[PDB]
Design a protein around this nucleic acid. Structure first.
Ligand code: ZN
Length: 609
DNA sequence: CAAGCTTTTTAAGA
DNA sequence: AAGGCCACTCTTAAAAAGCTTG
RNA sequence: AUCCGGUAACGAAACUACCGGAGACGGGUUAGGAGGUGACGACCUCUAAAACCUAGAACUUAGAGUGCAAAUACGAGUGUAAAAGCACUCUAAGGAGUGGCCUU
């Protein structure tokens, strides 16, 4: 793709006349999608328990756009089947709507009322992306995580039968690879004979019921197995968060959310005065007609049509008058090899606090359509990634680590947890959220169990949504974006300064080799003149300043800097098994004590040299 | 009771 | 609660329900 | 209550201790720096900040500039006369997010 974003704050971009609508739209969109996703998930379970396994001439259920859209209509209180016209295929849609509506009645333990969920926002286009994004989540989850279900039912079966844990993984690993070329898998789909991996991409819906079946077995069938080995997966994703999610607003979405006939006529009057061309727009329905109908003639180029959207954005928003216009007015960054010129793409993603402007190359702007020797001179460093010590970088004589605690302090994790708990406690949800919803597992695939979670939440949905609608939760989301870059960038500057100057001490370290000693003395004045040797495994934001290379990680944690043999082992003989403390097993060592980061980082640098 | 107009929302579109 | 991966980045003609006029 | 660095123990660890700095999301209010006599301290004034309250702004990394806050000695013994930190501009280096899932 050729799309980039400029994430900033939403203040001032939307006029005060429409700021209330945008924030309310975000709340409404989250409520509709969050409830609709649960209804869709429950509806799928209804089908699974009522029609799985299928008959010889029955089709495996495939979710589409209209399934989720109907769920949104049901959540909004719509009882009339939202189907256009009468026909064979349209008849199927009407029947599907009735099935979902009946399930909605069963899901909640009281009679639905129409005038308890009514809304006055035209979120039809805004909700479309959440429908597509949710639908894509189902496909992504099936394709990228189905193998995990395969490697878990077999593992649980082996454990349930008393076999050793080590052998269970052996059987599961071999079985999964073999099936790439026993009832957990569907019949081979591709008639061309390609491996099963191609079939998974060809049709994800066929494999979706298989995951649901596996989850049911984990909850009840494998009772004897320890719970730690039966962590439930989520075959059917749904929006479980209560903090409002970011909505996507396009030219069509913005056009119908913040316009009326009185305002629409103003746009025509303003457009006529500035451009002198009358627009063939009669009402809010014909507003989004094609360029040919609006002007009566085809645009000279796609750019001309795109510019029409930009002008409409200007009338509805402060795109050309707000602070953020500095970064959107054809800004060309200094060091782009191609000299790309970036301009607003007529698309914005926002949640009422943070705003994400879409910016694309000027050449491609318009309406869219459906579809080696540097090692000698550079200074070399070794790096060993992790998850507690995120990065451990050493020059062979000294080491610096980017500990997870450093990022937490930079991102103010303790305060964010402190503030979030206080708001939850203040609203009285602490005695309910931690006590009730924690027991009923939301991942449960049993309709009875999942229904209990759904209705239990519904009794406190109003309180829960309002508590998390506070801007503090969304403001923290921007802080982590802001401070996370600061923490990483700040460490990058430290990396240069530490190794920028020749080492002033060369005696305290003993085991350093001659080649490594020479490297440490090099003087470097630029970020790009330092090469860091990374492992096979944050690096994306390090390559912008520091050149990088890959070093094998084979036995890096066992080999000793002092010896060709792996004489290192975890510390022993002390009251507590200290986490990363390492000690040699023999006296033939220039150094006895070692740390995992120092020892691991040293080996990576040594292999590079 | 008849007709015009507006506005959500559908639905195809590779 | 936090780090990694995968997918996506949507435009337009119209059906039908609701409202106004006498 | 957390991060970095150093001291010892033949490159040292969230129960080994000691030594020196950092910092506390955005807004209301506390205690600390600075000034009538660039004396002390009594009061007054600029600044600023956590306990508590709160629907709430902000792309990031190093530096360089500008601009701060105002009212002891004579005489024919005795009177009286720049710091913490805040904001703006630069150079040069970066500069795509949303949603779901997995894992701990
Ligand atoms: Zn050794």
């Amino acid at each position: 793709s050729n799309i980039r974003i400029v994430k900033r704050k939403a203040k001032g971009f939307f006029k005060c006349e429409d700021l209330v609508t945008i924030k309310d739209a975000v709340k409404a969109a989250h409520r509709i999608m969050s409830d609709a996703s649960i209804l869709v998930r429950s509806y799928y379970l209804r089908w699974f328990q009522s029609s799985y396994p299928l008959d010889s001439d029955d089709k495996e259920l495939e979710l589409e756009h209209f399934h989720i859209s109907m769920a949104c209509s049901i959540v909004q209180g719509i009882t009339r089947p939202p189907v256009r016209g009468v026909g064979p295929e349209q008849s199927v849609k009407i029947d599907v709507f009735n099935d979902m509506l009946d399930e909605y009645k069963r899901l909640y333990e009281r009679a639905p009322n129409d005038k308890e969920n009514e809304t006055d926002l035209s979120l039809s286009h805004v909700l479309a992306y959440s429908i597509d994004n949710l639908l894509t989540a189902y496909k992504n989850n099936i394709e990228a995580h189905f193998s995990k279900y395969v490697k878990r039912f077999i593992r649980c079966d082996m454990l349930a039968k008393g076999f050793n844990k080590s052998e269970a993984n052996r059987v599961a690993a071999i079985y999964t690879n073999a099936y790439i070329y026993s009832s957990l898998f569907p019949s081979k789909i591709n008639k061309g004979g390609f491996p099963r991996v191609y079939d998974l991409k060809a049709n994800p819906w066929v494999y979706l019921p298989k995951m649901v079946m596996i989850n049911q077995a984990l909850e009840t069938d494998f009772s004897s197995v320890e719970h730690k080995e039966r962590r439930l997966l989520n075959p059917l994703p749904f929006y479980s968060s209560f903090v409002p999610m970011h909505i996507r607003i396009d030219t069509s979405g913005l056009s119908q959310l913040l316009m009326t006939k009185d305002r629409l006529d103003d746009f025509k009057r303003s457009y006529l005065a500035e451009f002198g061309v009358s627009l063939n727009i009669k009402n809010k329905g014909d507003m989004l007609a094609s360029f040919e109908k609006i002007f009566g003639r085809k645009a000279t180029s796609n750019r001309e049509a795109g510019l029409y959207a930009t002008e409409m954005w200007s009338f509805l928003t402060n795109l050309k008058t707000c602070r953020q216009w500095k970064e959107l007015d054809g800004v060309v960054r200094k060091n782009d090899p191609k000299g790309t010129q970036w301009m607003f793409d007529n698309a914005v993603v926002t949640d009422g606090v943070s705003i994400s402007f879409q910016v694309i190359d000027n050449s491609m702007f318009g309406r869219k359509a459906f579809s080696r020797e540097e090692l000698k001179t550079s200074k070399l460093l070794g790096c060993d990634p992790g998850k507690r010590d995120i990065l451990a970088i050493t020059d062979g004589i000294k080491t610096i680590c980017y500990t997870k605690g450093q990022r937490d302090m930079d991102t103010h994790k303790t305060i964010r947890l402190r503030t979030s708990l206080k708001r939850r406690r203040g609203c009285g949800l602490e005695e309910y959220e931690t006590q009730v919803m924690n027991r009923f597992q939301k991942r449960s695939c049993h309709p009875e169990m999942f229904r209990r979670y759904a209705c239990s939440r519904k009794r406190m949905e109003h309180m829960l949504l309002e508590c998390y609608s506070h801007p503090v939760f969304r403001e923290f989301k921007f802080l982590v974006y802001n401070k996370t870059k600061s923490s990483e960038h700040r460490f990058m500057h430290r990396v240069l300064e530490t190794f920028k100057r020749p080492q002033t001490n060369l005696s305290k370290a003993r085991c350093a080799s001659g080649v490594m000693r020479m490297n440490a003395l090099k003087e470097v004045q630029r970020h790009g003149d330092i090469i860091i040797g990374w492992g096979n495994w944050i690096r994306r934001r390090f390559e912008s300043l520091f050149k990088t290379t890959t070093v094998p990680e084979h036995y890096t944690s066992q080999e000793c800097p002092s010896c060709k043999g792996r004489c290192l082992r975890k510390a022993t003989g002390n009251p507590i098994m200290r986490h990363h403390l390492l000690r040699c097993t023999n006296d033939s060592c220039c150094s006895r004590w070692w740390n995992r980061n120092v020892a691991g980082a040293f080996n990576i640098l040594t292999r590079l040299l």
